[PDB]
Design a protein around this nucleic acid. Sequence first.
RNA 1: GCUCGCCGGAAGACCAAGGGUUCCUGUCCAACGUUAAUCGGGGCAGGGUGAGUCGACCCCUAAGGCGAGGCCGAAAGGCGUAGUCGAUGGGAAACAGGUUAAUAUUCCUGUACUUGGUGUUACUGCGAAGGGGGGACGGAGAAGGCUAUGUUGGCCGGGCGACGGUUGUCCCGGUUUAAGCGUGUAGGCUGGUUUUCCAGGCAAAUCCGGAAAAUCAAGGCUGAGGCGUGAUGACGAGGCACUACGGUGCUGAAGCAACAAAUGCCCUGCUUCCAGGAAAAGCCUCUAAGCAUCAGGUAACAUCAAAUCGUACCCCAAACCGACACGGUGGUCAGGUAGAGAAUACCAAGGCGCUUGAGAGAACUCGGGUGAAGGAACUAGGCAAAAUGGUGCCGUAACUUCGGGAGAAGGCACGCUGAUAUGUAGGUGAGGUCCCUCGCGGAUGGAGCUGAAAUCAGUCGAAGAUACCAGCUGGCUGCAACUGUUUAUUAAAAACACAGCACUGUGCAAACACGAAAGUGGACGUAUACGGUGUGACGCCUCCCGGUGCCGGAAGGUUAAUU
RNA 2: AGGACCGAACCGACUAAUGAAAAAUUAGCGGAUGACUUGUGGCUGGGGGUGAAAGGCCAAUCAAACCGGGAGAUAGCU
Lengths: 46, 271, 94
Amino acid sequence: MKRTFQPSVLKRNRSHGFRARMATKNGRQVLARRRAKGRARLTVSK
Amino acid sequence: AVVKCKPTSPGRRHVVKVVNPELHKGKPFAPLLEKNSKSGGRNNNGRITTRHIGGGHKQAYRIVDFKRNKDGIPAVVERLEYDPNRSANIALVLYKDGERRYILAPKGLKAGDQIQSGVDAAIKPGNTLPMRNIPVGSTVHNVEMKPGKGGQLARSAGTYVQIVARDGAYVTLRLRSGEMRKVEADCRATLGEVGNAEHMLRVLGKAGAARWRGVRPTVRGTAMNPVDHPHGGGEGRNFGKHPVTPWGVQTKGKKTRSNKRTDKFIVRRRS
Amino acid sequence: MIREERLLKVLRAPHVSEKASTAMEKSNTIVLKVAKDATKAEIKAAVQKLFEVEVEVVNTLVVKGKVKRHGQRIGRRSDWKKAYVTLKEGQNLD
RNA sequence: GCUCGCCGGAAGACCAAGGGUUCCUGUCCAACGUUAAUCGGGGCAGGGUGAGUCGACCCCUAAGGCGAGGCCGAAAGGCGUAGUCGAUGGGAAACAGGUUAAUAUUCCUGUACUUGGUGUUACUGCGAAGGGGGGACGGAGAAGGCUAUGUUGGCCGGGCGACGGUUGUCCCGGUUUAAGCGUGUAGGCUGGUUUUCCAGGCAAAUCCGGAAAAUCAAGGCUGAGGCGUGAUGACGAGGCACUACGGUGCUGAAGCAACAAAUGCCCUGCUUCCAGGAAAAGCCUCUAAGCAUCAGGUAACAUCAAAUCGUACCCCAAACCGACACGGUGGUCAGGUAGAGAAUACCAAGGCGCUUGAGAGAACUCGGGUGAAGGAACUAGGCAAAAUGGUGCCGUAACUUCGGGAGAAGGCACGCUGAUAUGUAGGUGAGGUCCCUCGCGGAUGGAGCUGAAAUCAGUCGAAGAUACCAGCUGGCUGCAACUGUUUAUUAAAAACACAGCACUGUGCAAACACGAAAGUGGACGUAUACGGUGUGACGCCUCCCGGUGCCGGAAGGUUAAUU
RNA sequence: AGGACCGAACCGACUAAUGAAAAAUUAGCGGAUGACUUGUGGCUGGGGGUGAAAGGCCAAUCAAACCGGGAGAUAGCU
């Protein structure tokens, strides 16, 4: 059965990657939030 | 000519083809071509703005000349061509100076016919001259509404317009709709009717044919649930309401012209 | 033209392994560890100057670092650049 | 190690994606492995991924994204021009053999190619953000020419049979060879060459386009395959020396022909249809500003250059997505016998026996086999089973929209051997002989090879479409015309859609829709068009305006802000 | 020629019996040149999308997704 997650690196990066997050305001805020929390992996970026 | 196809299969039974042998069997004039990608009836927001559009065959865009400005040069018709972009047929013409253009093929036009634009041009089919030069009572097509803009009225397969009157700076046209309309007398127009008049006699004959023409199927509002359409819901088949659009506006009669800027040019509305 | 200092900083070490030994003995090819940033021409220049020996050609590759586990803690070894340097016929290297 | 069994259009081989060391070697067996474990995709250590020509990067663009100015917007921001990104598409170049425990079109051996510089001598119009050409394009169908590949014969090597026979019309194996370079064929497309002029190609153009005029019928482009060379080479069945029993080193015959033949190539071709079928660069070409005897261009020759990143391994799976060593997952390769076949059966190459076993041979459950007599009596219901099942030929009703119905129904033949005919009809096609504008040519010729289908005669069986495979059929009737779609995971239908019909709106800055707007779709469309609503092939058809809607009217009544 | 026929791949999911499986199995079943199917990338966003329309689908979630916040909502109820 085709399960929901069907990985694709490029698609992952474009969707969720660092630059994408940077591009828009809301993404930047998300980034800031994550920094505040102390996340080790700020983004999906490997 | 129209051709009723033999019923060798359902979906072929009711088919009627409109076959013109005189069209060009060959690849169109490539210089005048250009790309034309499909919308899916969706705008820049990405939302569907006009339902029932989608798919269909890849099509190129022939660059038709509706402005028709090569004044004084006589042109000769090379061939008639299938345009997927319109109900009419187009004609590839060759001006004496070596330029080629696509034009709406009028009714009587065929290969070898000579045509001409200009004030001086002769009043014969396919020739184009300002409507102050065109005699009253003539049939014309590809009519400009604004001078210099390009023909906008009467471009569809078997349309034409009647010049009923010329009163000073304006002439009054009889549009195919039956609407009588004033138009500036200096606007341009092409003599005769537009060509492919038996276009209406074709019948698709199956669902797939409609799809080929980029038309997605139509769901009736009454078949929906109320949350979707004003007509939705009802146990079994119920329709206890006045007909309306998906957006609640009355459909069977309610007029919707709101343009107060051009009211003056409409002599008489259609009926 | 490569600067001497850069040349000196290129070459990290000789690589000892069975495959390396075989390459040395048969094909007259030395296997070096080099700076990850070091390009082929650079490596060649450095070979020529610092080992005083003619080079035919350099093949390079990047070795990825192994993931290991010290006790309970996971940790990755460094990636590093390997270079097969083929030396001109009759070139004997100390 | 020897037997047995399974897959073999896969359960084999190679990739992409995704994973990220799982690869190889040594070592260990606590935990992990549904048992044991000396084994492991487990632990620990070490090793392993070599590129000018493969891919990325790079040049070009699609859908789309971002977007200087700009337009719009309380703010945030939205749209969008110039631009710039964006492959899943276009754009230069490599093949064969050998080698590692583990990489290889990357190492080595041989033989190649590419496109840049730089320098040269030789020549002499070069030059783009611009013009033109090209790239550049659909579906289906039909062949013909080919090859991949396979079969047989020939040849070469080996063999003479654990049991009757087996020196022959016997048995086993092998019989392979690239890119490149030369040739330019089967075939496809197109008339060429020169001269003159011209409101066209945002300017110019010697280019394209268009007009004339002259002259010759061959000119050019394209093109699989074959042939030659590449190759006195490599590889080569197996023989022979050493042996850490893993292998290593030497050596090495023949290496031809015919037939058959793709879904691969010629073919981005041809024929045809309507639903009318990317873009841009690379590439060719034309000039402009320019420069002017310099640069630049093309000409060979020399030299330098090709960086960087990926390259292990899995990849229909125990390594990816599924919590698991648990169904899903795109591409490429496609042997033999039978067969229409990529179905099916048995096999090859190759890969596996699915990580608990041993007994026993109760009930009951699951999955199968057979069954006297009856044959739907079962049951809500013939559910399920059983049955039918192929090719050829004969034959086939109502009704019909004249196409259908129809494989209607129902029947007959079917194996093997011999003869017709020491293998026919056909297909292919060598020598020889003749012609020739000479070649991959044309005629004639028929050797050899291959080879159905039929008829007649015989013959065995209970049975010859013998296994696997492979329609059940007919009669009346509701609904829906039909092919389609649908509740992912209890509903596939009479529901939706449909072609068709009708009403209605909409004159283009269209109606309408998304948008505080700008704008966008509608549509680069224009009433033979587009939108909305209902009905729903086809046939015969299809009173009430009082109510509520809509349309038109505006005499009077009433009536806002305002005053 | 064909939204033509029989039929593998491929797409589905009518009947049947039966956790390896949070929808599968085997045996049969429908389509199989098209209103087909499929890879890669792109766009549409929550009273919003998309919808051959079933209130279907929008990450095992849908008559209004998920995450965080108002928030210790309110609970004459248990």
